[PDB]
Design a protein around this ligand. Sequence first.
Ligand SMILES: Nc1nc2c(ncn2[C@@H]2O[C@H](COP(=O)(O)OP(=O)(O)OP(=O)(O)O)[C@@H](O)[C@H]2O)c(=O)[nH]1
Ligand SMILES: Nc1nc2c(ncn2[C@@H]2O[C@H](COP(=O)(O)OP(=O)(O)OP(=O)(O)O)[C@@H](O)[C@H]2O)c(=O)[nH]1
Ligand SMILES: Nc1nc2c(ncn2[C@@H]2O[C@H](COP(=O)(O)OP(=O)(O)O)[C@@H](O)[C@H]2O)c(=O)[nH]1
Ligand SMILES: Nc1nc2c(ncn2[C@@H]2O[C@H](COP(=O)(O)OP(=O)(O)O)[C@@H](O)[C@H]2O)c(=O)[nH]1
Ligand SMILES: [Mg+2]
Ligand SMILES: [Mg+2]
Lengths: 426, 426, 162, 18, 428, 428
Amino acid sequence: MREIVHVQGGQCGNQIGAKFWEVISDEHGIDPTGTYCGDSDLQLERINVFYNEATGGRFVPRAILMDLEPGTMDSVRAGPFGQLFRPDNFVFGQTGAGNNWAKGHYTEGAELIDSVLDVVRKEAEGCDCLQGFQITHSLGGGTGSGMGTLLISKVREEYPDRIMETFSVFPSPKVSDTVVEPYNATLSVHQLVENADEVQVIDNEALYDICFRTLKLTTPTYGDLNHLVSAAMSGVTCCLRFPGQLNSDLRKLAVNLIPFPRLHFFLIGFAPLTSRGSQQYRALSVPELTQQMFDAKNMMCASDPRHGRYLTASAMFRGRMSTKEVDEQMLNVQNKNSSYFVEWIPNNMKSSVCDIPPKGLKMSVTFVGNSTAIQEMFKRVSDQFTAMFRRKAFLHWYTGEGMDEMEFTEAESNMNDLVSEYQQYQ
Amino acid sequence: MREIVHVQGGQCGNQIGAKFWEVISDEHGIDPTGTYCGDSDLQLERINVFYNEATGGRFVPRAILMDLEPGTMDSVRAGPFGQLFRPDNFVFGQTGAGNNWAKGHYTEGAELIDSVLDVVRKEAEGCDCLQGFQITHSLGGGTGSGMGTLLISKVREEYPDRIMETFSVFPSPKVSDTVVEPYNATLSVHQLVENADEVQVIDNEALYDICFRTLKLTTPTYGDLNHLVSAAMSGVTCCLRFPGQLNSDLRKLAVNLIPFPRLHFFLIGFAPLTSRGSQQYRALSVPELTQQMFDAKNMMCASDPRHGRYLTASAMFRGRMSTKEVDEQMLNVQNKNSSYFVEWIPNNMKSSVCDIPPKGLKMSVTFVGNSTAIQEMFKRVSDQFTAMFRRKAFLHWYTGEGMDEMEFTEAESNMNDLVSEYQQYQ
Amino acid sequence: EPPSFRRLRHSFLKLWNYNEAQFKAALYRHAFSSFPAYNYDTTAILCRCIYQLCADATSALPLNSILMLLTDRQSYLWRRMARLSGYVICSFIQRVVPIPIRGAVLESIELKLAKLSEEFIDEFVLYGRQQGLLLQPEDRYVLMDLYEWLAAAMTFSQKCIK
Amino acid sequence: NRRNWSENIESLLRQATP
Amino acid sequence: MREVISIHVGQAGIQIGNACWELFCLEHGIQPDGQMPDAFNTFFSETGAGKHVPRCVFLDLEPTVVDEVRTGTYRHLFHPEQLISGKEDAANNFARGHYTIGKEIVDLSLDRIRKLADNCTGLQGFLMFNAVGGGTGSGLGCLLLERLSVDYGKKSKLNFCSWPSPQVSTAVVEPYNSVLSTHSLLEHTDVAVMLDNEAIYDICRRNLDIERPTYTNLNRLIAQVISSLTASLRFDGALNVDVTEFQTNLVPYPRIHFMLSSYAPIISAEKAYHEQLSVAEITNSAFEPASMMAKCDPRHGKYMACCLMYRGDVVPKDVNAAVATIKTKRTIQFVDWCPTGFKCGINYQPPTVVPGGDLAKVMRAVCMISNSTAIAEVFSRMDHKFDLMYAKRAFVHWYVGEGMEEGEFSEAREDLAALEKDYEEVGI
Amino acid sequence: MREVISIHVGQAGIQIGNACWELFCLEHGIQPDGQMPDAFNTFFSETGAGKHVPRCVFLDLEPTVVDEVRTGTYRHLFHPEQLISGKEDAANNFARGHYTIGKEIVDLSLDRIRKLADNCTGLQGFLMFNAVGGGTGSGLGCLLLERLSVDYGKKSKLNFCSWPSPQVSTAVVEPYNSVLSTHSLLEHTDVAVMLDNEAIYDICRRNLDIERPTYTNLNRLIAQVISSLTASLRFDGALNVDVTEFQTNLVPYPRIHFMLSSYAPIISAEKAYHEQLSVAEITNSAFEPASMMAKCDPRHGKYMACCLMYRGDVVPKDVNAAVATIKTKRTIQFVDWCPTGFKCGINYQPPTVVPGGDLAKVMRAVCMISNSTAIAEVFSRMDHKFDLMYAKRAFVHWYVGEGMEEGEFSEAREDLAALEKDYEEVGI
Ligand SMILES: Nc1nc2c(ncn2[C@@H]2O[C@H](COP(=O)(O)OP(=O)(O)OP(=O)(O)O)[C@@H](O)[C@H]2O)c(=O)[nH]1
Ligand SMILES: Nc1nc2c(ncn2[C@@H]2O[C@H](COP(=O)(O)OP(=O)(O)OP(=O)(O)O)[C@@H](O)[C@H]2O)c(=O)[nH]1
Ligand SMILES: Nc1nc2c(ncn2[C@@H]2O[C@H](COP(=O)(O)OP(=O)(O)O)[C@@H](O)[C@H]2O)c(=O)[nH]1
Ligand SMILES: Nc1nc2c(ncn2[C@@H]2O[C@H](COP(=O)(O)OP(=O)(O)O)[C@@H](O)[C@H]2O)c(=O)[nH]1
Ligand SMILES: [Mg+2]
Ligand SMILES: [Mg+2]
């Protein structure tokens, strides 16, 4: 039936999906050696969406682990739930793109992407027909945005009607690691805007703000951030694995949240998120769920939703709840926060329920929402790009790899009219 | 019933033939002493195809081990499963061909081939109706390529309608050893096209490739490579020795793949082939068997089939599998990959099922495919042949003992017309 | 037609005649070599001394970009080698048609040509003399014939100057 | 003898039980 | 399979090189004989049974230093042909060490380099130690820079030069030596790292509280810089940052690849007993202008690029919480065309202190490599010292009598003067 | 079965033969009396019960070296007429060793040659070791070669000749004995191997670090060369390349059979200690022109054929990878008309190490015998030495008063100059 071949590019991509298969294996009751445990038929009737039989009863994930440097793939394989991946789905480079989008896309990711198209066609044609692909990578790196988006382009011409969905971490406003952030970011956003169907936008500074303000975690590591993103990544695919009162496949999220095909940039939230000492003090039902997810401190992007207008939003509830309070608790926030929603679209907002909650919680909800509020994040990466381009800085590392300054300039023009079609809706 | 008489030519054929007689021996439960063990009917139900009773209960192979040096004879005998052979079937040579096609075919092959034909007719007329012979040798040597094909000509004129199956280990494009490769190769093939029913090309560097990328070996020896070839040619003769729902013999196979008597050179692939960690991680089924079989990396030959057209094909499956899935998978690889198959033959391939799998495999498959993409071997040994011949290089080690230049001229003329016959069918 | 410009006319026709594959490998020979010790000492001087006068730019470049342009037939380097010697390469089969300087680049040529060790100067003397005697290694001839073009160009340019 | 000693593929051509 | 070849030329290259290979063998656990009681292969080659030999070459034109290494403790650690000696002193003379007596040893050293780097593919770079003040340090070291450029064009080249500091110079004619060296290391190395002698002497005095140090005391601190530099290639970290990352993040234009260095903490056992070595604390002392080990106050310059090698039990929360502090503080300033201006990396392994050394056990430390336009003035003081001597042909017969004639002095003048104008136009 | 008959003519033949047979007795494990404390049938006969005698003749006109052999340690190891002595020396004259005093010792040498060759049919050929610059090594060499040709025509007559090395000669009249030697062995020798002193001296200089080797130190090297070639005849291996396989795969044209040699690694205790002697590294080091054994440079020579014998724990896959890496390595260039240029062979038994010698325990070693067009330079400079010899009749009165007239020097010039232009036309 339905099937999602996960594809994982970059060091950040592999670490964020080592934890993605951590909570998916937990949710389906899977030993790190692939054996099922948990004597309930309701995990295993749709295990073909994310796993495959391996004639020994263990389940191999449909994950294409991909990197240009051998180091971090040795880390995921040696980590827990790390031998679950099959060895031939690891594709390795020997040199590694040095945070350089030019060499990642063109001169040394090209001989490796031949093997990547081989291993993704190994598992796409193995099933009868899949639903789509999900790709997790960075846009500030070299191996993720450079070579991983080369995969994003090539799978589009070979698989046109299928829907591909990217969970990309973006450059951060305040804290700027990996000093060539906007060069790799604007060039990747250029190629990704005509080669993707859903773009879930993630920001590391937003993850640190969630881990401090709502979770009260004094020492958040990268595993703590990767738990938070992956919890949303499970909630966006709940209905494809579990039943519910109002099922919604992932294509339903695409058709509902995209009024115009060139705008498909989203903002991701996850609820509930409660501090460990405050867990027993807080009631857990639908009104307390919906008041959390429509807060900027709960959102995973460097963009305040109050500064823009929600074009079309959606919620994927989870667990045993009433369809009644899915209706008017989602509606009373429309008619109270009237100014925050767009006028020329009535009933802006998709509601779905997937009856199986995540483990340790009785209900949850995942927010995927198209917003004009993503505008200022685009302006910040754009004007930093022109800041370094007006003085010709760092361009010899890119134009010396088989590039020309063409690909910077119409990336900028294709970026500022991505700005213009957003800024015309508020 | 039907018997196949094995002949090992040259030191290559002796080592890759001794590897054959221990995997057939293991398949039929025969100890190296010749005593049976394994208490099952189907192992001994057809043992006369490869073995003869010795009125003491031990089965002797119908194998004539034959060479011009005792160097590899005593290594075959002293090796494990080496005392299985009859000592009278050995034909020693004392002088040794100096890797000359002339010195094998003409000088000391003359007075030794009368001592091999007397035991070949002894093994042929001993049974009631012989099916045919299989011979196994390399085309880069002097004694195997030169005098081994001298045996091939005279078993043809003595037994015309019997099947003459040839396992030729062709010389290398890249890593050339035994420096007179194209002189031994071009002189062999122009004499072998007139006197062979089936020929199967095997390349050492393709076996090296299989041992590296698909099987992941760090220390590959010759015994590794010989076991790929032996396990491949066990699947060719499965239906001759075991019952099946759809039977296929060698004469069955020759009608399928020979539209014209000039082209009889085939590609061999063996599936499944997985490494240590990967063997417990893949699902052993028909669609992955045919997908891992219809690819370049599994071919035991250094010619890419995607660089031409699969003219005819065949697959001898082994195990208890569906006859549905075998035939539907043959239709899928033709319908999707239609560009790689020639148009004036509807359903270029066929299949067969042998109910007895190899030991330690639930299911396997071998592939025999006549393709026009193998012409790249013939040209790349033609331009190497004309590289030395154009200015009379190494010719005095051939013309000094009874071979002249005008049948050297007939050697490339019988070689380019093979390439031209492949060009017109592509 | 002056004899100085005629030596330019003759010198180019030698390097154009030399096979592109042979002159590719031979030029890479003298750069990566270690035996007789003059060998790269001529290479660093001469290969740069081509590009200095044939670009009229006193700035130097990395040697790997110099080497590729010195042998790639349809490059800017051979393009201006043609124009200086009274030729134009015309790509169709690149048939070449016999058509009819900054101060700072001049001392850069002069100073570093006077670093060519006592070997390379006097095989160049004997090579011209034995060319006449032959009428009456294939590796080392490549740089020496490259210095046919340098000697013809540098002498002719200062002749027009004074 | 030790010219042809495949102690690894003879067991790679059977289902290993690690 | 990562590997780094550590080329050492000159007496400073050898004596610094003895300290870092002492640190590498002690950190990786191998005894001085070569055997340890699997990510050490960036610096050590396997040799048969349990043996690990260094990946380096030693180059002096004299036996007086290198033969003493063969006489010393690490004699069975180093391969004999790895340590290469000439006979006669290059004698503070660029011309003799580049034209006259260096040629007889370049062919020996490059044969060894090719035989040592072709053993495994995927070579990562060439880490080079030299002193531009000395004769064979500047002259022979320049000569191998053309060799490694033409042979290995695309390979990374890290260079670590012991530049003559303004007041302390310990010789006379190096105002001629380091202007001839900087003329030819502009186009033959990828990253140059600035190190001055009194810039590490003054760190030893205020931080190590050592009033009477020696060269080996300085070479411990330089070895700590290199170990935290290539720390990620040897040990797994949260955010691995290789030496390919340094060129893609710190040199924005191929000429301006000079860059300074620093290390923090530099503390002995009498102060680690009292200090809490917070991530924010050690990075503020790393950004402290007196803590530069290149003798160049960055307050009279503008920061251009920045790189930090955190090393130890450093959580990625604290590096972001500390880099925001240095962004908001005004006395440090960045250039206006590099708004995003930081590169950070974290390795899990804590720094290793050598027994008998003056340092202390520290649970976390920061290597600090930054490019700034303040490096113009260290070339400017170099220009004034050279122009003073060259006004009347001083010490010129000791350079022109050995093969090179008049003209390389003027080319070194024009190339360094153009480097001043290039630094100025970038910094606006 | 298979066997080889060593011939040892000249004082170089006696001393090299001592090292070859000392090594061979050490390989098969036989005491100097001939006992043991069927792989030895190539070099040793089965004489009596438990005794083994060599298949070698020691044909030499100097009694002071071969009587000293028959009174030393191995005096019971050799049968007494294997060691054959004359009365007076040829004393570096081709004419005396071929015409006057050589004709009374060939008739007795062929008595022992026929008496040992009729032991068993299955002989591969002869291994004739001689000195070109000598008088007994060249004059008796010519006479013995032509009687061996007329009696044993199709047998593979191999030659390991001590050619006069280019700049040191330890003689004055060596160009006369060397030009007249080639006039014999172009029509007689099937496979000739170029050995010379000076190239074996400087591979002892740089690889064994021995600043003064004697002749026996050279003799261990040549003994290991012939041990690696004929190890295929004695011990079983993956690719057994016999003596018959040598002459086909190395000789494209019958006149050219002049091949150079290299044996690597050749390393003492200090530097068998720091490498891994992997197949790729020890096949590159065999191909260095420094490790040549003829003082002949392959840089100005084009390769024609190249044989590589391996001994030890050698895996075929890394051989095929390494021989591909040296084909893509383009310092050595193969001739256009011979694209494939390799004959490899693998033997598992490593060379046993001579105790008290100069080489150490090596797991795997490479021998190499290669044909190239670089042989023109080793014949052209002896041509230039000989044409000023014969210009004004220097040292001619000795030769012409010995039995040969004026004129045989002239056709010795004409056929060697024909050999020169033969090597020029091949590499076109
Ligand atoms: N930091 C540091 N600098 C050193 C060391 N040894 C020498 N130097 C510096 O090197 C400079 C002089 O160059 P040297 O390395 O001593 O000499 P050289 O490079 O071998 O060249 P020659 O003088 O011709 O032998 C002096 O200014 C010293 O400051 C050392 O161990 N550590
Ligand atoms: N490699 C090597 N060459 C030797 C050795 N002994 C002698 N030679 C060579 O032999 C040449 C001189 O000939 P000898 O062998 O000494 O004398 P001979 O062969 O007995 O014949 P005569 O010259 O007549 O005495 C010298 O030039 C050396 O090249 C040796 O032990 N090793
Ligand atoms: N959420 C998350 N972000 C990461 C992780 N590792 C690295 N990053 C981010 O990725 C950026 C570094 O780029 P990186 O992904 O390492 O480059 P790449 O390997 O070429 O894709 C940093 O700004 C980090 O914020 C991780 O495990 N989780
Ligand atoms: N696949 C395979 N090839 C071999 C084997 N032995 C030798 N060869 C090949 O045969 C060629 C040499 O021919 P060889 O058999 O030694 O000469 P012959 O004795 O005259 O037949 C080489 O190119 C080897 O690659 C073997 O056991 N298996
Ligand atoms: Mg100096
Ligand atoms: Mg003599």
